[PDB]
Every structure is written in C-alpha cells, then in structure tokens.
A = this chain, B = another copy of it.
Amino acid sequence: DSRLPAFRNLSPAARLDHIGQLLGLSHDDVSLLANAGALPMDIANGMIENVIGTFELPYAVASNFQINGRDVLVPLVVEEPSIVAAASYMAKLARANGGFTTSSSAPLMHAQVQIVGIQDPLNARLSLLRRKDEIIELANRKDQLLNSLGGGCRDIEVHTFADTPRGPMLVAHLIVDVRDAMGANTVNTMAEAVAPLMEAITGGQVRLRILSNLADLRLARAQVRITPQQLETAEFSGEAVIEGILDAYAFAAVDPYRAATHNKGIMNGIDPLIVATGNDWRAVEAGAHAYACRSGHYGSLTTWEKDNNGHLVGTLEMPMPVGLVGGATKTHPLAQLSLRILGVKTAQALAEIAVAVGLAQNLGAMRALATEGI
C-alpha cells in the first residue's frame, strides 16, 4: 500500500521510520538515510577523479503510485519544489481509474561501427549483409556470459551516407540484447571485436565503434485515464479543464518553444528517479530529446486525447536505457537501497516505473498551467 495519508506533515525522521516499518527495512538500511555520510569518501574517491568531498541533494519518496496493479514507492533526488508533490498528487488521481498501465520492449541497444575510405559504399553494404551471420557469431563469441543470461547480438543493419562533408561512409549497427545493464560497455566491446572483420569485408578504415544513445529499440511505455469529475476545481468544470489540457497538448505538439518546456516537465520526474538509482541521467536525457524530433520536428513526447467516454487519456513512449547492474548503481549504498524500495527485478521493470513518473509529472504541470494558475 503506497498511499501515505498525512505523509507531507510528518517529520523526515517520522517519514523514514514509516517507510522503514512499511517496507520492513533493516536498521542498517534506515541508518543509511537517517545519518549523513552514507557514501564513504573511500568509495567516493573511486567513482570520479579529483574528489575533495561530497555534494548532497534531498532524497524524497513519492506516494500513491500504482503500476499494473502493484503499488510502489518512488525515490526521487532533485532540488526543485513541487515535483514530488505534483507527481504524488497526480498518481493519487490515476488510482481511481486503475493506476498506470505499462509495457516495454526487450532491452535492445545499438552499437555503431563507422567505416570510411570505401569507393563502393553501396556494394560494400551488401557484402556485409551476406556474411551477416558470420559477424553476429563473432560478436556473441566474445560476451559468452551474456548469451547464457539470455542476451547477446540479435541482428545487424547497415546504413550508408554518401553525402558527407568527409566523403561517403558506411555505418553498421549491432543490435545487441543487453540485459538489466544499461549496455554501454557490453555493446562498445562487441563493436571493437567485430571491427577487424568488417574492415576485411568492406576494405575500408573503421573509425568510431561506440553505442548510440538514441535507443529507439529499447522503449518504455505508460498510460493513464483521468475522469472530468476528478479534475473539477472550484470555478472550472471537469470538462472545461480537459479542454484546457488538450489546448496545452496541441500547443506543444506544434510549437518547439513550448515543446521544450513541455518535455522538460516530463524529465522533471524521470531524472530524479534515475539519479536515485545511480543511473546516468545524461544518457536518458539525450535519448529522450533525440527521440522527440525523430520526425524532423521537435514535438511532444507524451500524447493527450479525449476518448469516446469524454475521459482524458495520456501516453508516454520513450527510450529508457536504464540498468540494475551498472557501475554506480552497484557501488553507492543509497542507490542499492532505492532499488530495494522500488522492488524492481529487471532494468525494464524500472524503466516502466520511470515513464509512469514522467507521465504523471507532465499531467501535473499541465493541470497547474491549464488551471489559470496566476
């Protein structure tokens, strides 16, 4: 049960105590939050290079979230007010109608291998595709463990660019199935091993061998339904507010100046969760915003409509390159704890929670804005 009545009135120590009893945490865990210094300097000096101390940010916990029926507590680390309050309130509303409904695709990541110096990029492309099974097998031969976990390279796609400032180039894509890992190193490794062969097949120089942060093959999705009776303020009817939100949505879907702000609101709830779990927040931002203008125009990541029942329905589909076996998510005592609070077992389970927070957050911001909030 994620509903915490009068939680925003309890003192921090009482809130911790509560979450402690609720989740049945050990004292060793509660101590990590009740006492500054959870991250020892000896560990902190190992993550970054010229460490001189530590920087603190508030570690909150949103309430009311319900994902696919199960309740869950969402830990968020951020410095801006109203985010947790709005995420939580909006989550409260979604409850009556079934909470958030999520889904996701297999944890697929791209690995790009740039190849220059080819006089025949187009022919060369077909040479790679015919000896495709060969390359794939050479890639999986390296990361054997991964294959046992149920991951590994699954397919290859080659794209050519014949109109580049530095001549034509060929770009092969390794579509690797990482696993509960963000996939930066697993993918970058396969790209390095496969390189020698591709260079032999095509006859050109391999330049970059790196992953693409535009994980359009690793998407997380979320949905909500909000009844007009739920949004009814004092001077505004339930339906009049919905029309307001749709107006705001349409506005973002056509003007990039608003879209940027619209999408920032979304990340307002996603990033904090990512930082809380010790995940790279830059990778999610880059993938989120790069996906927004996939159709040649920077637009809305979410979508808001009114269904047959005159109910507000909203969606959010975006890349979620997140992980549980990552670098920092493992060494930071508090990050390990966040995952314990979340109760998530797969990276994708965590991704589904991240897009729900953001969807709730976008709705919260839009409601405030559409409610003539002066």
Contact = CB atoms under 8 A, between A and B. Distances in A.
A253 B165 contact: yes
Given A15-B52, A49-B82, 6 more contacts: A48-B78, A50-B60, A50-B62, A54-B59, A114-B248, A260-B286
A91 to B, nearest CB: 12
A88 interface: yes
A106 B16 CA distance: 45
* Most B-side CB within 10 Å, residue of A56, A83, A88, A207: A56
A62 B169 CA distance: 36
Interface of A: 4, 7-8, 11-12, 15-16, 19, 32-34, 36-39, 41, 44-45, 47-63, 76-85, 88, 110, 112, 114, 116, 159, 161, 163-166, 169, 171, 173, 192, 207-214, 244, 246-248, 250-251, 253-261, 263-264, 267-268, 271, 275-276, 278, 280-283, 285-287, 289-290, 292-294, 296-298, 327-328, 332, 334, 369-370, 374
Contacts of A16: 52-53
* Copies of this chain present: 2
A46 to B, nearest CB: 8
Contacts of A57: 39, 54-55, 57, 275
A310 B175 CA distance: 38
Nearest to A276: B55
Contact of A192 (B213, B250, B374): B374
Contacts of A171: 251, 255, 257-258
Contacts of A15: 50-52
B334 A84 contact: no
* Most B-side CB within 10 Å, residue of A62, A258, A334: A258
